[PDB]
Amino acid sequence: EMKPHPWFFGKIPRAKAEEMLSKQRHDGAFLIRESESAPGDFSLSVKFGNDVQHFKVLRDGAGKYFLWVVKFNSLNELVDYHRSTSVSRNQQIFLRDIEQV
Ligand SMILES: [Cl-]
Numbered sequence: 001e002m003k004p005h006p007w008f009f010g011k012i013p014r015a016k017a018e019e020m021l022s023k024q025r026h027d028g029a030f031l032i033r034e035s036e037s038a039p040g041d042f043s044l045s046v047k048f049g050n051d052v053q054h055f056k057v058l059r060d061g062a063g064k065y066f067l068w069v070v071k072f073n074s075l076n077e078l079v080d081y082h083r084s085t086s087v088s089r090n091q092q093i094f095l096r097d098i099e100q101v
Contacts, residue, residue: 006097007079009033017045018052020098028096030087032057032075042075048093055087 009017009031017033029047035056042057044067055067057075064071065078067087072078083095 005076005079006100007031011036014043014045014054017054021045021047021052022050024098026096026099028094029098030079030095031098032079044079044087046087046093046095048088048091053088053093 007030009020011034012020012031013036014033017031021029021031024047027048031045032042033045035041035043038056041059042065044055044057046053046055057078058066060066060071064073065075066072067078067082068089070081070085072081079095086092086094
C-alpha cells in the first residue's frame with residue numbers, strides 16, 4: 001500500500017542537507033534534493049562518517065538518470081540500484097533510508 005518516499009526533500013539548500021544528514025547515525029543515510037545552483041537538476045546527499053558527500057544526478061540525451069555509468073528511467077530506480085551498489089568510488093557507501101523524527 002502506497003507511501004511517499006522518505007528521501008525526497010525538494011528544494012532544500014545544500015547546506016541544510018548537510019545539517020540534517022550530520023545528525024543521522026548510519027553511513028549511507030541520504031536524500032535527493034533539487035539543486036539550487038543548477039535549477040532543473042537533482043543532487044544526492046549522503047552521510048559518510050563526519051562528512052556528507054554530494055553527487056550530481058546526471059542525465060543522458062533521452063532523459064535517463066545516472067551517477068556514474070548505469071542509468072535508469074527514474075530517480076526512484078537510481079536510488080534503489082544504489083542501495084546495493086556503492087555510490088562512491090572511494091568507499092563502500094550504500095543508500096539507506098533516513099531514521100525519521
Ligand atoms: Cl558495490
